[PDB]
Design a protein around this ligand. Structure first.
Ligand code: ANP
Ligand code: MG
Length: 334
């Protein structure tokens, strides 16, 4: 209905100008011209809730959600599955909480833990670069970082990706983990400057200025990157975010940054480092997304882009448990 679209637009204009009696009559007119106008049902719901008309607001929201019989069934069935899913997901977080407390309880000086923390550190760099096509072996990465002599017939780009990750991880561990106060945009830029500096020092620590494609994802226009990065770091330091479970917080931080895709390259590596900063600041160890999980990783990011972030949170939860199980399993040393 062309009149319904016009009635709604004019209703939102009258609401903005504070004339709510004229807004109400236009909302009613929009629904008279198109009773199934989702946009007008939802907006008239928001308008109703502002006036503390909770029953009317709920009626309009529920109407918007149940236009056709298949929507009706979807809402009935979802209301049944949700509590069962909330309970399954919460159980999994409590299993992770239990294994974190077991790893944390282990005394820092322990011979077994310290050997394993070193071995996994190189494992973690291997996975974070190998997942984007880096063909370096675990032994080659140990050589590059322990000796600081290059490896034969393997591109300097691949080797400088490793050096950058090492530099970025050391920077986080020394400067950011223990530091008190807010996470700034400059903290993210400082991580990116080290992650990408040794491969592309012109672009390292700098937001992109061009339109890009990330697989199936359309990140914001470069003109909007800075605005969304300001809203992002506001959320990072928000009271809401500090009340989230660390794994959820770390997972959402990771997803939100790769969604914005603010750099021309190293967005994944930076997001995974920011993820591990948040976990370490909450007393969890750094976790790995293995090379083998690339397909699953991309699938849950695509699902997040299309309006459900829970599969991504579960995937990060899964990855966290695998890491904790690896630390705990290495009591074989002791
Ligand atoms: N559909 C998607 N939506 C959002 N982010 C995505 C999507 N697909 C992939 N990504 C992320 O974008 C990264 C690739 O962007 P890029 O700037 O090249 O980062 P990178 O650090 O070079 N790559 P990587 O090591 O694989 O994370 C992927 O690794 C994911 O973290
Ligand atoms: Mg890349």
């Amino acid at each position: 209905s062309l009149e319904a679209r016009a009635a709604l637009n004019q209703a939102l204009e009258m609401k903005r100008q504070g004339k709510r009696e004229k807004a109400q009559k236009l909302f009613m007119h929009a629904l008279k011209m198109d009773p199934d106008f989702v946009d007008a049902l939802t907006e008239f719901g928001i308008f109703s809730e502002e006036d503390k008309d909770i029953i009317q607001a709920d009626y309009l929201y529920t109407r918007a959600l149940t236009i056709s019989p298949y929507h009706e069934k979807a809402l009935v069935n979802r209301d049944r599955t949700l509590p069962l899913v909330e309970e399954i997901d919460q159980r999994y977080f409590s299993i992770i909480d239990s294994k974190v407390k077991k790893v944390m309880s282990i005394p820092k000086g322990n011979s077994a833990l310290r050997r394993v923390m070193e071995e996994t550190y190189y494992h973690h760099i291997y996975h974070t670069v190998a997942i984007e096509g880096n063909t370096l072996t675990l032994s080659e990465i140990r050589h590059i970082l322990e000796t600081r002599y290059a490896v034969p017939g393997k591109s300097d780009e691949e080797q400088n990706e490793v050096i950058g990750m090492h530099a970025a991880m050391k920077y986080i561990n020394t400067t950011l983990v223990s530091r008190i106060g807010s996470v700034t945009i400059s903290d993210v830029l400082e991580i990116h400057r080290r992650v990408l500096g040794y491969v592309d020092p012109v672009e390292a620590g700098r937001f992109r200025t061009t339109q890009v494609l990330v697989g199936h994802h359309i990140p914001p226009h470069p003109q909007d990157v800075e605005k969304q990065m300001q809203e992002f770091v506001q959320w990072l330091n928000s009271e809401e975010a500090m009340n989230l479970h660390p794994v959820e917080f770390a997972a959402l931080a990771h997803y939100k940054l790769v969604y914005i895709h603010p750099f021309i390259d190293g967005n994944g590596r930076t997001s995974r480092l920011l993820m591990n900063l948040i976990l370490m600041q909450a007393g969890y160890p750094p976790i790995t997304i293995r090379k083998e999980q690339r397909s699953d990783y991309y699938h849950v990011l695509e699902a997040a882009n299309e309006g459900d972030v829970r599969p991504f949170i579960r995937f990060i939860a899964k990855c966290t448990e695998t890491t904790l199980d690896t630390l705990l399993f290495a009591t074989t040393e002791y």
